Design a protein around this ligand. Structure first.
Ligand SMILES: NC(=O)C1=CN([C@@H]2O[C@H](COP(=O)(O)OP(=O)(O)OC[C@H]3O[C@@H](n4cnc5c(N)ncnc54)[C@H](OP(=O)(O)O)[C@@H]3O)[C@@H](O)[C@H]2O)C=CC1
Ligand SMILES: NC(=O)C1=CN([C@@H]2O[C@H](COP(=O)(O)OP(=O)(O)OC[C@H]3O[C@@H](n4cnc5c(N)ncnc54)[C@H](OP(=O)(O)O)[C@@H]3O)[C@@H](O)[C@H]2O)C=CC1
Ligand SMILES: NC(=O)C1=CN([C@@H]2O[C@H](COP(=O)(O)OP(=O)(O)OC[C@H]3O[C@@H](n4cnc5c(N)ncnc54)[C@H](OP(=O)(O)O)[C@@H]3O)[C@@H](O)[C@H]2O)C=CC1
Ligand SMILES: NC(=O)C1=CN([C@@H]2O[C@H](COP(=O)(O)OP(=O)(O)OC[C@H]3O[C@@H](n4cnc5c(N)ncnc54)[C@H](OP(=O)(O)O)[C@@H]3O)[C@@H](O)[C@H]2O)C=CC1
Ligand SMILES: Cc1cc2nc3c(=O)[nH]c(=O)nc-3n(C[C@H](O)[C@H](O)[C@H](O)COP(=O)(O)O)c2cc1C
Ligand SMILES: Cc1cc2nc3c(=O)[nH]c(=O)nc-3n(C[C@H](O)[C@H](O)[C@H](O)COP(=O)(O)O)c2cc1C
Ligand code: NA
Ligand code: NA
Ligand code: NA
Ligand code: NA
Ligand code: NA
Ligand code: NA
Lengths: 313, 313
């Protein structure tokens, strides 16, 4: 068995990334039903709503699903209590220390996966007792690592650094890229952007449609002095860029960033003032599609990509 | 049959990228004698010196070789005359319009390849009549495209956009990355950083030893307001970073950049004031090695990568 398939009890080594405003039970349960692992994105859910999405996912699928928890989540104790009482099969943690919750989640029966952006942090997660890690490259949508290491340079270094399974994230929007990730030595892939634009994603339809119109170079890893974030170059980004060019302080950039822009953009469709988080691979997606269409494409595309490789060079 | 092998008449689809201060005839002839395509880097050579390196290369290998010419080269008429008279088999142009010289080089018997960093420019180069393109990602060493597209995101877009062969550059330092490039649909790879640190490279021993000590995150795409360039975060970089943080104008940044820092760093081993151009993949290289050793590792590493891949997912 592929190491991730066996670890998580899934048919295909494809995980849908936990994404604020996108990863409702509808997206997560559809990915799980298609044989991958769908993740609910707790980052955008108050505890009561999180519990509802877990229950709805549980009703909609008999297959494993998980919850992604950014560790800066403001009511952590409440959502951890929920996640352990609901026996969530897989928990994916990011943006914080894996030492805090890993042993407790594992004692409660969850498999634990932590998101990292370097070999050094991959090693610290392995030492913390996680079951696997996601190594996320520069091209990924949303908050990314300060080192700016791309998927192609990150994966071989991370898989040489640890003995536990490694999931590649950042730039995986096709069967070819799934093959490239397994060629580099990852056991599986985590797909964000392509699933964020799927029919089942909870993102606003105006957000999805706007993302489909974007072209190469429309995203930029930005706000680096506050927290590097990859987003579409919209009006909000332009304000940030003008501020950075004038030598704005961290406090000025923080004031401009303000609060709630990701919700306003991704969930509510404010394409001017929103923080439009999306990966570089957005430029590959041109029309609406369902989770099942994407899953079939990633699986069948992998097969064709691999079959067309020369036996040697 | 591999499209680049057949176009260029070489055994392995591996090209050493033209690199200022590194790609002398010793590096270029050694790569070509190992079955790839070694490029001479004309960017760092006055016209008489360039003629010397072409002639020493021809004396050292009976196999195909090429010359890399950045199109900002100050005495362009003199060096094209030399390249044409010597009938260089392959000419790789970068940093300028492929319309200026392509038709003339082809009329003189050279294969012409142009370096691009977007699918849009790939198409413009194809319209200009080039024989193939190199598509160079964000992680590459030296001057990169302003879109900051990574190799993983750039290759499948470029390959879908043109009918001519595509060589992937940026992040290729192992057989696993060669397998990744080919999985994305590239025909061949161009390897810069790993060859820049080889025994045969003309770069200063202190520069090579210094690159070997560096770790993930030690490079940064910088000077973006002037011309984006990926280099090691040395004292020069810190001066640039401090000036960008205070809102320096473009003229202030040009003044700081000055002239000849790339030669001082790469060729003369000035690790403090030099512009240490090198790719993110530098962190995978730990010790000195020859071109023959690199070529064998790339070829055998490719087969090992395939051995690790499941036929279907
Ligand atoms: O009713 P029913 O159709 O069952 O609604 P759902 O069960 O899908 O969702 C319940 C609530 O959660 C909201 N929502 C859906 N996805 C997310 C998300 N990823 N993050 C935060 N909130 C989300 C819904 O908003 P909305 O109804 O606006 O989709 C609704 O307010
Ligand atoms: O820009 P910020 O990072 O400050 O935005 C924080 C986001 O967290 C969301 N949120 C999710 N759960 C909680 C919670 N437990 N308490 C407060 N905010 C929460 C908010 O959505 P919302 O606006 O729906 O609270 C808000 O958009
Ligand atoms: O004569 P021989 O002993 O064969 O030396 P080479 O043929 O290798 O070099 C001839 C001249 O070119 C210089 N040189 C070598 N590589 C490069 C490069 N890639 N870019 C610019 N200059 C280079 C050498 O400098 P140097 O003598 O400093 O190596 C020497 O001055
Ligand atoms: O930072 P810059 O981009 O201004 O550096 C220009 C570099 O080009 C090199 N060079 C190669 N060919 C020529 C030429 N024909 N005329 C002038 N410079 C050339 C110079 O090396 P060099 O210092 O050896 O002239 C110099 O280091
Ligand atoms: C809109 C959006 C929201 C995201 N929110 C989160 C999140 O809440 N927690 C997290 O760990 N990663 C988050 N991510 C990162 C994704 O889980 C995933 O790792 C990334 O999107 C993968 O790269 P890709 O976009 O190139 O597919 C988000 C990504 C996007 C595009
Ligand atoms: C030290 C150095 C000098 C370079 N000089 C040139 C150059 O003169 N012309 C050019 O087209 N590219 C140049 N490059 C880019 C390389 O040709 C190549 O495309 C890049 O190194 C490939 O990415 P990699 O470093 O990750 O292998 C240089 C790269 C480096 C590291
Ligand atoms: Na991210
Ligand atoms: Na490993
Ligand atoms: Na599109
Ligand atoms: Na470059
Ligand atoms: Na093509
Ligand atoms: Na090293």
């Amino acid at each position: 068995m592929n190491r991730i398939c066996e670890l998580l009890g899934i048919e295909h080594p494809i995980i849908s990334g936990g994404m604020v405003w996108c990863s409702g039970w509808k997206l997560a349960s559809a990915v799980s039903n298609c044989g991958g692992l769908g993740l609910i994105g707790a980052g955008s859910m108050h505890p009561d709503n999180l519990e509802h999405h877990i229950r709805s996912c549980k009703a909609a699928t008999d297959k494993p699903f998980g919850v992604n928890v950014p560790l800066l989540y403001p009511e952590m104790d409440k959502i951890m209590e929920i996640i352990m009482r609901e026996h969530v099969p897989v928990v994916v943690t990011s943006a914080g220390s894996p030492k805090v919750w890993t042993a407790k989640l594992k004692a409660a029966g969850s498999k634990v996966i932590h998101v990292v952006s370097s070999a050094t942090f991959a090693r610290k997660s392995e030492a913390a007792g996680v079951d696997a890690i996601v190594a996320e490259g520069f091209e990924a949508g949303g908050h990314n690592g300060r080192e700016e290491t791309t998927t192609l340079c990150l994966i071989p270094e991370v898989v040489d650094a640890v003995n536990i399974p490694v999931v590649a994230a950042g730039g995986i929007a096709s069967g070819r890229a799934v093959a490239a990730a397994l060629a580099l030595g990852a056991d599986a892939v985590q797909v964000g952007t392509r699933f964020a634009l799927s029919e089942e994603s909870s993102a606003h339809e105006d957000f999805k449609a706007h993302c489909r119109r974007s072209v190469e170079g429309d995203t930029m890893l930005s706000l680096k002095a506050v927290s590097p974030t990859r987003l579409l170059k919209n009006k909000f980004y332009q304000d940030v860029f003008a501020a950075e060019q004038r030598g704005a302080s961290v406090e000025e950039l923080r004031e401009l960033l303000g609060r709630g822009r990701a919700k306003q953009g991704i969930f509510e469709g404010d394409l001017h003032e929103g923080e439009l988080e999306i990966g570089q691979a957005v430029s590959q997606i041109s029309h609406a599609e369902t989770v099942a269409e994407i899953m079939v494409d990633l699986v069948d595309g992998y097969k064709r990509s691999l079959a067309g490789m020369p036996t040697e060079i």
